[PDB]
Amino acid sequence: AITSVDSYLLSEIKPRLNTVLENCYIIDEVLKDFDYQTRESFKEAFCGKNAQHEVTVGFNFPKFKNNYEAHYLIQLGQGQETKNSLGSIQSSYFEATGDTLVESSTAIREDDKLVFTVSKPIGELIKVEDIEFAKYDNLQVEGNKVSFKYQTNEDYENYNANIIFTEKKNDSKGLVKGFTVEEQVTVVGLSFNVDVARCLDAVLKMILISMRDSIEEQQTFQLQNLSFGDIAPIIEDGDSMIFGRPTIIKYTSSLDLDYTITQDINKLTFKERKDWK
């Protein structure tokens, strides 16, 4: 697909940041190496459900004033194409497949089959969690349902699973045409307190490490590489300075389009014609 690393990072960082900040022992583990007073002051101010201060995330160049006490500024950077395929063919498909998804589901009995229901039509099934079927189990997929023989499996009549699958758009042939790009985004934790900037740096590094395992950047946005700048005053001529430490996140990812092929051939036919010269 076409991709937007900045909007991915914003969407991914915001919930993760919230869920760490609402959970005191995570911060208590992340900041174990800092000075005791720095740790306790940060945990008192920003952390837990009762926290009176708050962190914020957003893109650069807003028209309004931000929470300069603690704010992650996201800042889309450079990139370049790095590797190309022969014919620019990144892949080919017989059935137009959408995004990868993971969904929780439960088995139910139906007509002496077990079935799992999924919210969308299954374009491909990658994994039913914790199950490997035998041929006897007569595994079949149909529409948005996975179906599974009941006879030997009655103990599992309400078994709970996670389905990893991917959507289908439509039944069509085509070529995925495109290339790989290596692209940079900068993130900086702004604070007018230097110890807050240093803690926001630690929290962001933890978040990015945790992010490396996510399906989003396992399937796309691969090879996350991190670089770190000096701590410096970002703005120097207010009533106080604003400090930050930049980090650069670099990703390798595919830019591509679905070139559908309308041509289809369903019968050869043969004829002999005679040359009398």
Added chain:
Amino acid sequence: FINDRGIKVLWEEAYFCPCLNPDTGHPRVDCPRCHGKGIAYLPPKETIM
């Protein structure tokens, strides 16, 4: 003195438009209340400046 020396103007007061994207923080370019500027304006007021 000001009423003698100033020209008549219409003054309208700025405020940020509530159409700003809750994630990206940028204005919606199709917004009718503000024509792609992030700033909406209250009804005009007659003044001399």
